[PDB]
C-alpha cells in the first residue's frame, strides 16, 4: 500500500560554493527524515536504505530546489534562503548547468504547475531506484517504485482528467533530472578535491 496522502504529508513535513555546500549539508539531514516518512522505506533492510539514499540524494535535492524556485525570477532559491543567480553561478564555474536547471526543470515545473503531491511522487520514484548497485533484492525496490507510480497516475487522472498526457509528462522530466544530478555531482567532487568545501560534514561523507 502506497497512499499519495502520505507522500504529500512527507513533503509538507520537511561565495557561492560555500553557500551551495552549506545548503546541501543542511538538506541532507532533512532528506533522511523525509525518506523515513515515505511508506515502507524504513521497512527495507538498513543497508538497502543506505544504498538508495547514496544513489539518489543529489537528484532528490535538485528536484526540491527546482520546485521551490518556480516563483523566483531567473535564479535558484536554496533551502538556506540564499539565492543563486547567473553571475554567481558563472563565478563558481557552473553557469551551464545553472541554465539547464532553469530550462529543463524550473521553467517546465512552472509551465505545467506541477503540484506538491506530484513532486513528492517523482521524488519517491527516484528514492526507490532499483538500479542502485548492491541492493540485497533489487526487485523489492522495483515493487515499491511500481506502487508509487500507480498511485501517481490515479492521482493525476482524478485531479487533471482534462490533461491525459500529464502523468507521462511528469515521468519524462526524470531523464533531465538524471543528467543534471550527474553534472552537479561532478562539480561537487571538484570543489571538495581542491579544498573549497566545508570539512567534517554529512556532505563530505556523501562524497
Amino acid at each position: 500500500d502506497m497512499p499519495v496522502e502520505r507522500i504529500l504529508e512527507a513533503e509538507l513535513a520537511v561565495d557561492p560554493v560555500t553557500n551551495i555546500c552549506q545548503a546541501a549539508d543542511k538538506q541532507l539531514f532533512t532528506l533522511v527524515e523525509w525518506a523515513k516518512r515515505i511508506p515502507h522505506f524504513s521497512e527495507l533492510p538498513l543497508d538497502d536504505q543506505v544504498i538508495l539514499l547514496r544513489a539518489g540524494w543529489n537528484e532528490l535535492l535538485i528536484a526540491s530546489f527546482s520546485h521551490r524556485s518556480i516563483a523566483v525570477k531567473d535564479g535558484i532559491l536554496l533551502a538556506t534562503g540564499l539565492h543563486v543567480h547567473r553571475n554567481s553561478a558563472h563565478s563558481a564555474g557552473v553557469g551551464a548547468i545553472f541554465d539547464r536547471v532553469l530550462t529543463e526543470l524550473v521553467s517546465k515545473m512552472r509551465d505545467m504547475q506541477m503540484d506538491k503531491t506530484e513532486l513528492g511522487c517523482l521524488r519517491a520514484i527516484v528514492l526507490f531506484n532499483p538500479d542502485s548497485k548492491g541492493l540485497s533484492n533489487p526487485a523489492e525496490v522495483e515493487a515499491l517504485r511500481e506502487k508509487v507510480y500507480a498511485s501517481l497516475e490515479a492521482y493525476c487522472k482524478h485531479k487533471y482528467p482534462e490533461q491525459p498526457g500529464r502523468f507521462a509528462k511528469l515521468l519524462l522530466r526524470l531523464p533531465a533530472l538524471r543528467s543534471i544530478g550527474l553534472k552537479c555531482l561532478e562539480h561537487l567532487f571538484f570543489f571538495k578535491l581542491i579544498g573549497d568545501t566545508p570539512i567534517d560534514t554529512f556532505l563530505m561523507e556523501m562524497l
Binding site: 539531514f29 533522511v32 525518506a35 523515513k36 524504513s42 538498513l46 536504505q49 543506505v50 539514499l53 547514496r54 554529512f202 561523507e205 556523501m206
Partner: peptide, 13 residues
C-alpha cells in the same frame, strides 16, 4: 557511511 547509517536508525534523543 557512519553518519547516514546512524541517522536512519530510530531511537535518537
Amino acid at each position: 557511511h557512519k553518519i547516514l547509517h546512524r541517522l536512519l536508525q530510530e531511537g535518537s534523543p
